[model samples]
Target: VTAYEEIVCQVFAAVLDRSDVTADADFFALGGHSLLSLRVVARLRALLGVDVGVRDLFEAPTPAALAARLRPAVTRRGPDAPPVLSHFQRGLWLIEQVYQTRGAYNVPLAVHVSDRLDLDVLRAAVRDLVARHEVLRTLVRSPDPVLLAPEDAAVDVAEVQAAGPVADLLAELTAQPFDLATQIPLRVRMITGEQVDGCVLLLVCHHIAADEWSFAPLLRDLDTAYRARAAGRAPDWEPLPAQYSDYAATLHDWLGEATDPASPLRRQLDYWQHALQDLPDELDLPTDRPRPATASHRGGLARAELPPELVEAVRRLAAQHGVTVFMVVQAAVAVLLHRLGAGDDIPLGSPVADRADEAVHDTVGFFLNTLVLRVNLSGNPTFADLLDRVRAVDLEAFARADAPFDAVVDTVKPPRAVSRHPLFQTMVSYQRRPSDVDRLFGAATRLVEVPLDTAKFDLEFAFIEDGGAHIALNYAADLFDHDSAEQLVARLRTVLEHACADPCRPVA
Candidate 1:
């Protein structure tokens, strides 16, 4: 065997933690999943300094085959490259084009420090963060939309004395509208003088530049830069393997034009069209009041906790059924809706993280895509049998998840409605893995989630497991009253308990 092939095989063995790995062994056959393959790729990049991608591994699963394709890393493009938005970003941009959404799309975070912070160091850290992430410095221009990332993009810490409660200041700051064409779409404020021996650092960004996944890395990088500046040195982190622009360019090339029948984009779009051909025009549910002519976007959140015992039971059921907790939760939601007068064919919108490539995992940007998971409950099947159907649906949906949601909707051409969300009125999101960014700021800085007064859909069941499992049900205030929302959460819990108590029972 060649020396290069031997080295590649060794890396595979070490990464997979298996001594039986051979040069000709297939990665997938050897139990190497996507995430594990990424770890292998990362290890190889660090060791050999070769440019490789996740697709490369899929194409060449064997170590000997991949070693043959290894080459020197390609130089990354300079920041001056024309910033182009992804298909998802283009859709979001279009929404911003209208004068409707206020701070509905804004993402805000509050970091509470137990001790006084060095404002100069914090300012430098913020500047370094803006420099590191192109999305933070990007500006969107319309009339044939384009993104521009200026080289001298700067983010300053607007230090102000606390006029009142810090939470009130956060709300006021987050409510401000963003001028995407001129502003960098990021804001940082330092509130001091009120809570003596402590302060609150408010960081707010337009949804275009950030998402729920972006928050952890954003804070981690800022903390790193802050500590470096405190030590009188710049943050000495390795260069990012890829950037947001790289992903955009790759997506453009992969999707190509929709006119080409053989294009990947067209094929995926066709899959969605066929899958959602009979999707219900509306998920007629019992509401507190009559539906309005248009969505008001005002929202309220009702939260409930899933105890450790229930979480464990759910996990066991998922393991036994060879599915996921998300599938189980989704099945429960379908059952709840079906019993509550919504039909058997329940379509719920779920957000899937599109960070397939580990290279961009730490890069801060919006990489989430919504998938319309239409669960079939028409046969009056048992909970276990229904899970089987849900599993099948989830697998097929995930396979075609690369197609952007807007593109899918445009292809499907569903019945239009301004009063409620098209395709699906309710959404469910389950996040089990949580980030350890609370103490990254080098102190006991409590991470406080600043509330927003908006909802993008009629109802969103956000099940997050960050140390504890809880469901934060964000409901549109225009549709559901607070009591109605709370009752909905209660019903969901009841459904889950009953479904898990006996999987063989017919869900009614």
Candidate 2:
């Protein structure tokens, strides 16, 4: 068998917990779900040292086929791979420098559970999760250049009794923020209720170390480990084929790799440059407060749920356009902004899953990259026309998904300030599913986003497809007051509701 065939066999065998994995065996047929598919791709990315994506596996479910499609991503080594910040980490580092903000990139997932609890076993499970993922144990030092140093998985679990208001407890814990220079970026907090069997758990992680993609895997592992420990067994999963550093190293090299105009990666970089070339510096969202000289991270959240029909309408509309639900939602957002006087050049920013990067597909780290999806909503075209344009833009953005946000900023050379990110302020996202925390612990347990005083953008819509559309509008506290944020979100949904009602109507 070829090297690719051999490693494919090993990755499948290891992930499936089976000794015999045939080259002809299908990945999904072998019981691979999305999460497992991610693990499989991640394992293969590391072993093959190639830039493989998740969908590739679905297209070529068999080992020989996938192996045939993998591409060797690295060219020259960096003398030897030393610990350095991945592009995502580097961007967050820069943001910290500008805002000097607290809990700036702190991502918190809080869950409520009334089920039987085992605190001691849970503690072991938490530590086990950390020990299994090196990214969780890694620390940053403010060297001449920032460096990643892996520390022992020795961490803490802080517990509070009658944790006054689960939301308050979370805000206090999450707001504590990471020093990065000396502190591990992940922490756990347990809020015990009056009853022994009920409590809340907060898994707080720094953005440098995690994103939504990373959060689910961490939770799934913690759940398994918790169950295992509760059953009086130590968790002993197979060793990961690669760690976050391997992903980071590959990314770092790719970022600095010499240009080849004919290469696939280079083509992506070129696509971003051309697509976003001559883009405006801002989207012109009307804010209540004037643009501050520098950005202040104080932000508030406004939650809303659209009528159930809107969700299916978006999916059906997207299907008609041969696009994704995301594209359709984006099309509506563009219409909303145009109606609200944001001008024709509407630039929005959202992070891509970045699992397309073979190296980090399964690792728990800050592997997400932001896309400044610049769409032109000119000429008062029908919503159908907007969909077509947005679909084209979406395809190009996904094709060039690996172009790092930092490099895009540097390449585009848009005017910058300490107050805002370069290229686009408003962001809208469509989550196919709700937060995994919301799905935690069966019917008795559910997720609560312990809202924090943090807003990294002027306006962002975190939309979830839960039977219908549920959304949270996180806006800058410095810019909009509570009521204004609510009204703004309400207007967005109103626009979406009406647009979905008749998508062919022209917007003037």
TM-score of each: 0.82, 0.80
Q: State model 1's lDDT.
A: 0.77
Q: Write the per-residue lDDT of candidate 1 for residues 1-508, one digit (tens) a residue.
A: 1224545676777777788876579998988999898898886675445587888889889986786565122235675666658777777776666426677778787787876678888888887888778778877877333443345665647877876766667767877778877788798887787553477888888888887778778888888999999998889888677777677777777777888998877888999999998889878787887778877778877887788888888867765665567778899888888998998889999987666454664578887788899988887799999988887887678667778888888898998867677789899987643356557557777676565577778889877777358777888888899899999988898888887789999986
Residue pairs whose backbone atoms clash in candidate 2: 295-419
| CA-lDDT, candidates in order | 0.77, 0.72
lDDT of 2 by residue, 1-508 (tens): 1235545766787788876577678887887778898998886665444678887988888886776565344232343555556767878887776668778688887777776456687778877887777677677765222333324445767777763565766777887778777666788887886543577888889888887767567877888788788778877698665667676666655655427666555666677778788887776767788888877788888987766677777656654554556666687778878888889988989777655434444458876678988888888888888877886676557657677787777777888877876788888786533344554534266666667778888888877654256778889888889899898888877877766778788877
Using lDDT as the measure, which candidate wins?
A: 1
Task: Report lDDT (Cα) of residue 182, candidate 1.
Answer: 78
TM-score, cand. 1 vs. native? 0.82
Worst 10 residues of 2 by lDDT: 143-152
* Candidate 1 minimal-lDDT segment of 10 residues: 67-76
